[model samples]
Target: DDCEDLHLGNLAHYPNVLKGTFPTESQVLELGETLEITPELLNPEGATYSWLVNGKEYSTEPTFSYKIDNPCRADLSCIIKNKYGKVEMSTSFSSNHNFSKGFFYVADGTFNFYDTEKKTAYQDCYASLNAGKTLGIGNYDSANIIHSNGKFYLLVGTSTSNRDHFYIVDAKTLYYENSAVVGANLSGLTILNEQYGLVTGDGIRRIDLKSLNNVRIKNERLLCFYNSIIYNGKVLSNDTYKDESKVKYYDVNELIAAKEGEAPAVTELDIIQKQKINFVLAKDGNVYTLESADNGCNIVKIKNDFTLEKVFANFQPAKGPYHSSPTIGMVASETENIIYLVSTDGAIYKYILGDSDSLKAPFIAAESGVSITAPLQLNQQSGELYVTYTEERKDESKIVVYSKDGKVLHTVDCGESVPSQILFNN
Candidate 1:
């Protein structure tokens, strides 16, 4: 029996050891994300390989590179055949994804963008869209970036300018998607899915993804600068200002149906009143809001039926120097353990959400003398915090990137932009 393994036929056992570095399965390739796959084959003695796409032979290279042309999952397989035997492996990836693997900013009318993979500039071979003329300008901080179906969409809106524009940019080859004037004096921009969105105080607008006839949302105020999400075809939106304290949302289909002269008008669901949910966020495609009152905060989730459920609460923090019913920027968390808050004194606090107890603890997350021009936001995946504020001039908004453990990574000396916002790629 031992002689059998020692003979030339021993080669027959080599095929079982033939392994290749396989692309991680079920991976999500967000729009404008890099797609490179290299396979390292072992125990291959003069082996020939074949790559298949959806069961058809596609290529025979050791490295297979694909540009995700659409927003869908693509199944790929590889086969290696040697004198000993053959081995086959398969993997797949979804093209419908988020744009967080990259970063962007707005300073005055000039915009800067980069790939988040290395947090490097995207301009060496930058996007194909051109910066448009100042069609409008309301200066209180405008412009936002979102992802969908293999592309990045950049939208600019201001309460003072009637000329608002959107550029559907591609992060890869043929980087330009489309750009044009959409709305007026844009107060904000909110996207539902990748195709549909709303223009604040105006109505719903479209950033043509498939070049189809751009369908519009309800002609209504989407709120100033990104204040809504879509749930079960409903617009879960939040508003700015102290008096705008109610959780307002509307049925998505109903909004459009009403706009099209349907019998039912855009049905707006006013959740609980008095809790002017100023800071709203999305995770797993749903919206979570934080409303503070009486020196306490309530973390609530907007259910599918627009019901407010208390997921957590914090009332122990010594709240002081708060603006007139003002909320110093708050980042809504999807988790249940803790939520991070930035106080007026430029201090970052964490509120713990435990059963029967909501605890608040202040931590030195950023260096002193660091004034915040915007709110406190953390990368949902890395817990890395991005504070948009400058040292001396609040008008010269600077973005400081910090480690979740309070380590300073970099300070972005943004020249003259309004309160900069962070939009993560899913």
Candidate 2:
């Protein structure tokens, strides 16, 4: 056996990002944010692109945008070659709400999606916006477009036409899959894995938009949320339209692998409920909940056996009166010891996320009139956070893009459509 260090340098696939500006310095990426790199066209012919993050190969699009789906920061390496090769490495990150290459499925009088990248305006995918006047709306774009399995899907209501639909669309063309029907009106649209996602309406749904199939995990109306919703990659149901406190866990894969007659198992956690749960967030495979009692709100780590473990508690959302009863938003960071929380009170809180119960107090990171309802979008590539809110006019909505320092960058006037969720095209 000969042990040798072979120098693969000066090879054919020497990678280069061609970056000279703001985006090149150890960029931050959000979950599902597709990052594009401009490589140098070598003198050699026939070069192909391949990317890898954390030893896992990503894609071969070469020039294709790399979507960061992994929930942790990892080493991202790029390689290109036909016979010779070049490779380069960089750091990548993720967040739950990076919808760059995504659009707003506006359900106004017309079928529309406004692209934020090209600032591409006046886009429509349907014949008439009157789908509402004809079909019944079970979808309100509560969760707009989702990218899974190399394809993009948008869930919008027929608005009373016939049924709710998930129109597969293009990121490059940014158009609908044209005519793909999912199921009934489902909300709380969330991806459980590369194969399936959970949406809510009359019952719990386990669907793989990529494969164009679905399996109902539960028949009860599950609670819908924008953040901290999915735990253990499984959509757990505890409460119904009447109960959000019941402890039930359904594995997504089981729901998919079952035959036409079989049902997936739903495991319930048997324990005592002390306080009412507000919102739940699952990060790095761990589930945490913010619950409230007669006092204020406290953070608890959800146990597999159905028990509550109080981790830490942060006070009111802010000093304002509206902050008394706040709608919560949370996004967890794996690399650092931090958890971000926001509320309808228009304030964002940063907490020291240490080992289990060891959490620091909350500090105001940013604040504005952004009422918390998972009403925030983060573009890690450009370091911008877009916040949306129901403004004065019920028919009009305001979307404001800001930086980490709480400075406003731009404003979007969405007229005539009460925005359910806001998406950006990067």
Candidate 3:
């Protein structure tokens, strides 16, 4: 009789035998200043669900939601437990909004924004307002701009007669924020790290953006702080005899740790310098030095020890005065290792790095006699490369687009004088 129907002791309560934490919710809603969280039960047994905001419990069911009345003041989280274990599903909800626009470059004191999507230029229509007031100069000698934390900081100067100043511009708006006078004329500028920036001319200056009003100057020339694969610390950069001749590593932290007057000179390796040296961080974590001179062009692979091997060198000099420096663009391709180098003399060389000691005989991207200047900008994603330069004896300018393999895609003649630098968004 007992076996048949006696004591069925609550079949719903079978010792609550559920295990493991609940899977985190897959979907989250972020509405500018608000966040909504929905809880999902992967294995909801004798389990209950509750929402927590900053460790305090909120009364909510499996289908319940909460609105962050003040996103800046509160942290939000949700907890689902089944007596065996608990997992936290939390995210910080903040009212602080950030956005990024794109990358740009300056040449001869003119700023040009590269539009990777549209394959054209982002023209600032307001540039004409202050055209003659030196708001922009076409004689820029050295310039560097870093897009960091939703802002762009540019430092440009000239070897000619002009006051060197640092321009802080909003990267998104492309509007000038402020300007500061540098101690000396600058030949080059680089972002050393988040906290420091390096500007070189007569000597190198360490600039602190937090204290932009008072930038610190270092007593050294041709010295730069760059990160290298071999050196995790800061490496001092110097170009001598035209190529990257020497690289000295410093425990930047150690140098900072040293007593004010106790720091020692740090020079790691010395190599040959090439003319018109440009540095690029390859996608492979290698530091590549691109050198172009009147004689030829060379690309040196910089090792971690600061030693270098000439990976690619084209000994062919320009038929005309190589008025422009060599511009290098890299493509992310698995099958083909291609580098695009253009000269002011209107020549585009496609150097293929196909396991050769140097670049194999480059195929002509453009005809030999064509004249070009500045640099050729490459859009890797769309496989398009653009070049903006002045033609011989022609006061007008031309912007030409080509395929990565050197086929002419399109040509546009910009009646205005083109700057000597071309920047493209990647």
Candidate 4:
């Protein structure tokens, strides 16, 4: 009960200190963000302070500002050698979070995620979970998310033929889980269920999500070159039959029942178009397609009875390239429905679904350079569109978000890489 006892007791974890005097909660911050630590002590008589990071001497200042870098696990402690004795105060921080709005993968084989709710952007989100290990080197075209058994998985596509062409990631943590070397030139993915999914590239392949085994169900070079969709238990897409282009579909049950080496029977709608069908959209019980031609483009609507009608024919605008195939995105509501597309000239064009009067001229919603690496995506809930553009021969790219009215919402920097299709974490 003397001065010797009091001095030794203060050194033992701040004896007699009240609860909540120092924080014990974990902290998460960005890579370059800083965390400052300034602890309050009971006595202030000739105190000497020294800061330590991961058991190494960092600084001798009373207030230490720690700049975050590598080493996801940061162990920080400070030695307060005052007249009474020496007391050690410590805390911890990291660079991890679960906040995400939507995510897009770039040509650098990295994923970029943004949180609309939090107004924060996370670049290279997947690699950050693994200390900077990327999915691939480049050539990633599109990605999709599928939920199953209370967990979410991401399916990534790469046009190049290699082991890393397809990847499956744990969506919550953006960590790599499984991968498959499937068909080349992978374009898009559609989830049928937890046990099965389908991907388009060289042909339509049925993927066993649980086993990661894939089998070709509709193997035709031209018929499966573009994306495909599954609606009402039927898979619909553009197909080719001996140099003739047609609208083809397959019953989902038949495709799933087909054997590993067998090809499913395909039915055609008897409608033919000389121009190539690049993108398809199905909304509000209506099906539409955007066809590309050298002279002009056509927006055709496929009726429920399999009749094809051109909503607009030979539509050409001066700002976009004539032969460029446009990618489509849409935001539909009770009052109005809007469609957005990225023209060949690297500009976004808008059109109303049923209002031909709004189609007199191309409505340029947004524009970048001459090349767009990915298809246009719309956060339908927010009515915001996302588009990515990359500079030619330069190590710079950007992901631009636009409101439904063509107003710029946000622009994300993707250093030295081309951003591809964006998928929201719904």
Q: Pick the candidate with the highest lDDT.
A: 4
lDDT (tens digit, per residue) of candidate 1 on 75-172: 67878787767788888766653335555554454435444455454321221123222313245435555555566566665443334366665544
Q: Whole-model Cα lDDT per candidate? A: 0.53, 0.47, 0.48, 0.59
TM-score of model 1 vs. true structure: 0.57
Order the candidates by lDDT, highest first — what do you get?
A: 4, 1, 3, 2
CA RMSD per model (angstroms): 13.4, 15.9, 15.4, 7.0
- Model 1 residue 134 lDDT score: 34
Regarding lDDT, does 1 or 2 come out ahead? 1
Q: List the candidates ranked by TM-score, beginning with the highest.
A: 4, 3, 1, 2
Summarize candidate 2's per-residue lDDT along 243-355 as a digit string, tens digits. Answer: 23545566666766755435567666542223222343434345665644334445556756446666545454321122111123454444444556553355665555445
Query: Which scores greater on TM-score, model 1 or model 4?
Result: 4
| Highest TM-score model number | 4
* CA shift of 25, model 2, Å: 40
User: Model 4 over residues 1-426: C-alpha lDDT tens digits?
Assistant: 468544634554332233455447766787568877666655545677788766778888767787654224456677878554777767767775443445544445566676655555666666545545566644424444444433444445545666554566665555567777776556546566667877765667888877778888767663443445555577776543124476677788987888865787777764554433433454546566654445665666666665666665345322212112223332233234666655546655666777676656555533444356556676767777777776756757777787767677887777665654566544
Instruction: Write one digit per residue (lDDT tens) for candidate 3, span 1-426.
Output: 756763335333322322233323333333233444445454456566667654567655764455522112234565566666765565543333112222354533555544333444434322421221233444434455556655566665544444546766655545456666665455455555666555555544556664554334455554433212224565445433233445445555644344423434566544344334344544545566554444665566665656676654545423222212332232232234655555434555565443454244544534443466544555555566676656556566666766756677665555555554444322
Stretches of candidate 3 off by over 4 Å are 1-108, 112-123, 126-134, 138-143, 159-164, 213-217, 220-231, 236-270, 290-298, 305-307, 312-337, 343-346, 352-354, 366-369, 410-416, 424-426
What residue pairs are clashing in model 4?
Answer: none
What ranges in model 2 sit over 4 Å off?
A: 1-144, 157-161, 208-211, 221-233, 237-244, 268-287, 301-309, 312-328, 333-336, 355-374, 392-396, 424-426
TM-score, one value per model:
0.57, 0.54, 0.58, 0.68
* Candidate 3 clashes between residue pairs 3 or more apart in a chain or in different chains: 230-304, 242-273, 242-274, 242-275, 243-273, 243-274, 245-271, 248-268, 346-370, 346-372
